[PDB]
Amino acid sequence: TGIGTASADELIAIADAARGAADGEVTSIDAKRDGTWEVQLTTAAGAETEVRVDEALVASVTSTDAADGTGPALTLDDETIRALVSAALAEAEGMITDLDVDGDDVSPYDASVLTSDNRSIDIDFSADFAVVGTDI
């Protein structure tokens, strides 16, 4: 696959994560075929640790808004996200920038696709994942 990197910033991030998991200075950084990284750390004494480094996601709360005084009928669970994404991309090719269920009740779902022409397409879908409206 796309094993390795041309990014020194990325190798440094991998070395820094590894140094966070054990003692010693970095003596080796090696890409595994599964696209994880192994880093060797070695103490002054000569003691060795091998550390696995993986992609992870970190979540932090940004804002909070209390119960206005309704809840969501529909939600973006995994199944619904997979359905919207295939529907959004069938309609227009590009990168999904936005999904929501906010929507407008006859069109409960929205997606935005960013296309190579750096042009942004807002799509409105029915409960049945049918395209009901676009905005280009």
Interface size with its own copies, residues (CB under 8 A)? 78
Of 29, 54, 27, the C-alpha closest to 39 is 29
> Site residues for its own copies, window 16-45 (CB under 8 A)?
16-18, 20-22, 25-31, 38-40, 42-45
**Contact status: 133 vs Zn ion (CB under 5 A):** yes
> Site residues for Zn ion, window 92-111 (CB under 5 A)?
103-104, 107, 110
Neighbours of 51 (CB within 10 A): 20
Query: In a 10 Å sphere around its CB, with 0-12 CB exposed, 13-18 middle and 19+ buried, how is residue 60 labelled?
Result: exposed
Tokens 């879908």 sit at which residue?
A: 125
**Contact status: 124 vs Zn ion (CB under 5 A):** yes
Q: Could you tell me the smallest distance in angstroms from the CB atom of residue 49 to its own copies? A: 6
Q: What are phi and psi of 81, to 5 degrees?
A: -60, -40
**Contact status: 49 vs its own copies (CB under 8 A):** yes
Residue 124's binding partner among its own copies, Zn ion, none (Cβ under 5 to 8 angstroms by kind) is Zn ion
Report the distance separating Cα 51 and Cα 37, nearest Å: 8
Q: Name the residues that contact Zn ion, by CB under 5 A.
A: 77-79, 103-104, 107, 110, 122, 124, 133
